[PDB]
């Protein structure tokens, strides 16, 4: 249990738009936690597609809260779009 732990975190939006579609979003954002728990600094490193996953992310990252006392400054969570009907969160 080393590092900082979510404590509040809800899963990508998933917009049935994309799943006619037939695209599997994966973007990879890096966001720095604070010692309050409070996600901050996110910033989208690699998107593609940039323009069809990118802007249900930071949505839910500003929504997101770690535990306390335990800031990461500089985390990585795939946003994978599984077709299965769920996100990577295990």
């Given at each position: 249990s080393?590092?900082?732990?979510?404590?509040?975190?809800?899963?990508?939006?998933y917009p049935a738009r994309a799943q006619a579609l037939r695209i599997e979003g994966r973007v990879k954002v890096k966001f720095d936690?604070?010692?309050?728990?409070?996600v901050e600094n996110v910033q989208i490193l690699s998107a593609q597609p940039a323009n069809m996953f990118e802007r249900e992310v930071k949505n839910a990252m500003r929504k997101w809260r770690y535990e306390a006392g335990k800031p990461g400054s500089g985390l990585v969570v795939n946003i994978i779009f599984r077709l299965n009907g769920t996100a990577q969160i295990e």
């Open positions: 080393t590092g900082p732990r979510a404590l509040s975190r809800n899963q990508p939006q936690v604070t010692s309050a728990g409070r």
